[PDB]
Design a protein. Structure first.
Length: 341
């Protein structure tokens, strides 16, 4: 392995004039190049070699800041918070108190609200092997109680990108942070990713109603259903579903997903501490947005594998708790390890 090179350059200004920087993490031709924006903690690009050793850009994204500012609805590459995915009715109860959120997804709250973590600028500083983003989300931001002191550290070692998210709070709150990177292992401009083979270490999933809220009941078995990825197989269909990862919440990350493109030979092993994984096949994409490789993105142009706690957890005490209290430390860790076959 070669030493990770870290550099920072201006990436432009938001409409309100806020400056945004782009951090580049580079581990050489046999490794990766990853670029991260201080805006929304966005992973703008991920480049990795194919089986012939040729570097290619894999993440769905845009070449320019203006596109991210204007089209945040896809959450391309985004650090998502304070609460990733949906809270039913844009409301929940915590310690006897009802919290009202902005209904930005029909009746529901999605991905932390209109001004969620993916649409604010983070402070950044260099650390060994990468960049650490830091921002305090004040008490009441998007309706969530408590000032949440958040640090998200992106580091690169050879072919593996590691993202560690840490937080503390000054009052009880809920927290569920993830990264919403979509990948096409054949390249973001290569067309559909539905031919990718996916294996998930998940024997159960979270069935939902038409608006993405989990129906009453324990996670359902995947056996006999279209959600069975226990053996590697083409993604093939449309998904926007949470899987209950075997083993639940873990103190150290373990491989929970393996994604593979037979054409290029690029492989991803995704490891996480999280109990859940949202698989989303980008079906909202309609060929109108031109991505970084200069090709308009159609449905399934990339796949998002978002490690997370389960949808609607603040309204579901049967799900692994997303509550954080003063004196406690929130920690989540996900590793994207690239290789070839």
């Amino acid at each position: 392995a070669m030493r990770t090179q870290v550099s920072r350059e201006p990436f432009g200004t938001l409409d309100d004039g806020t400056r945004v920087d782009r951090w580049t993490l580079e581990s050489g031709p046999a490794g990766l190049r990853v670029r991260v924006l201080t805006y929304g903690g966005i992973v703008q690009t991920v480049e990795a070699p194919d089986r012939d050793g040729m570097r290619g850009q894999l993440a769905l994204g845009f070449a320019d800041l203006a596109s991210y500012a204007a089209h945040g609805g896809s959450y391309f590459g985004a650090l998502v918070g304070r609460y990733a995915n949906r809270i039913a009715g844009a409301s929940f109860v915590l310690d006897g108190r009802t919290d009202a959120l902005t209904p930005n997804n029909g009746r529901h709250s999605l991905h932390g609200g209109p001004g969620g973590f993916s649409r604010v600028v983070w402070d950044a500083r260099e650390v060994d092997g990468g960049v650490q983003l830091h921002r305090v989300s004040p008490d009441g931001e998007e309706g969530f109680p408590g000032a949440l002191d958040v640090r998200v550290t992106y580091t690169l070692s050879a072919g593996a990108l590691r993202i560690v998210s840490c937080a503390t709070t000054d009052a009880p709150t809920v927290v569920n942070l993830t990264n919403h990177t979509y990948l096409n292992l054949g390249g973001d401009g290569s067309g559909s990713a539905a031919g990718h083979e996916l294996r998930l270490a998940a024997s159960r999933y979270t069935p939902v109603d038409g608006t993405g809220i989990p129906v009453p009941g324990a996670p359902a078995e995947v056996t006999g259903t279209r959600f069975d990825f226990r053996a590697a197989r083409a993604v093939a269909g449309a998904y926007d579903h949470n899987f209950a990862l075997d083993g639940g919440v873990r103190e150290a990350p373990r491989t929970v997903a393996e994604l593979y493109d037979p054409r290029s030979g690029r492989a991803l092993a995704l490891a996480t501490t999280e109990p859940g994984l949202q698989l989303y096949t980008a079906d909202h994409l309609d060929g109108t947005l031109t991505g970084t490789s200069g090709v308009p993105y159609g449905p399934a142009a990339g796949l998002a594998l978002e490690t997370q706690h389960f949808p609607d957890s603040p309204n579901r005490p049967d799900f692994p708790s997303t509550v954080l209290r003063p004196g406690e430390s929130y920690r989540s860790e996900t590793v994207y390890a690239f290789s070839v076959r």
